[PDB]
Symmetry: C3
């Protein structure tokens, strides 16, 4: 699967320029309140491209995709609130992690953290480019 990632600032641009899931960065440092849900914005828009398939309903196409937590989230108190995000074919907005902080204390996330990852429905290796 092929991703077109529009980075939304220059600082993020330099993150991405500088295997069935594609990691995303935590873009700005942030304190997560205790016992909370926080919509962390990821500083990108994306589209996923695949070959057309024939499907039961009653060239390359625009496809839907998935935001999975990274295994390593399990070592933090943070959980993805909506379990696995579903990002529809038509979505053109910023890509956001819904993160629950399950701890009684605040949690500091920092630019450079990869908590989350993009994945294809079919689990096929991922490729991307900027746009």
């Amino acid at each position: 699967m092929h991703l077109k990632i529009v980075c939304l600032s220059d600082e993020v641009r330099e993150m991405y320029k500088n295997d069935s899931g594609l990691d995303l960065f935590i873009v700005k440092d942030e304190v997560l309140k205790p016992k909370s849900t926080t919509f962390v914005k990821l500083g990108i828009k994306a589209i996923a491209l695949q070959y057309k398939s024939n499907y039961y309903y009653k060239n390359i196409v625009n496809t839907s995709f998935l935001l999975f937590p990274r295994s390593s989230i399990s070592k933090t108190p943070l959980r993805l609130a909506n379990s696995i995000g579903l990002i529809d074919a038509g979505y053109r907005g910023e890509i956001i992690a819904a993160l629950d902080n399950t701890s009684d204390q605040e949690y500091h996330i920092k630019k450079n953290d990869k908590l989350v990852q993009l994945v294809s429905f079919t689990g096929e290796p991922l490729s991307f480019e900027l746009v």
Copy 2:
């Protein structure tokens, strides 16, 4: 993917006789107790149909499908207990959202809330039609009585 949905009452049939995720309705008002897991019955049974694929094991078929939370559940204190529901190919039971209330007060869900959605393993667009039975079995809602 194409779903065939059996509505378990006229009320639910009305809701449905009126996208990569097909949203499902909360079908009865209900209170979830604080700090609880509640099995919320969604008033439907369903069969998913896809084109026959060739697969490594060593036309139009029944297929497995997925039950996902909605994005917007994020804003509530409710979480899907089993992360993502896996519904096997010939499952004929009622569809159920196992919902954790993570908060310490009650949570009132309401007829027409949409917490949860059905999704194909391929992430392809979903259709559905309403049907009276899934098969001839009493669990499919079919056959004699």
Copy 3:
């Protein structure tokens, strides 16, 4: 999709010598501390084989670790929601379990909290194998 599983002990092998999800066993009795997350080792390694596709004849493939429906009736939740096991991976399979309760939680050998699933949702078969490949982490090769 077809799985080859290496059982890391004879005990584990006996349980596996004795449908779109393949249930995996709790392999040893364990107490999980209250309000914690525990990396529970499942005593197996696995590889998944499917038909080569074409993206944008038989291939080694990535796969999914799902909670079982019945996990819902316990206080135990999957930390990472759904675990993604990459095609390359040769380590022991681990379930990261959040004990959401105030009390210790006892899991027993032969409990089944978690299951393996295909990215396609297709029916799963499996066999037991002594190695995944020739590497040491794959448990194969000289030694």
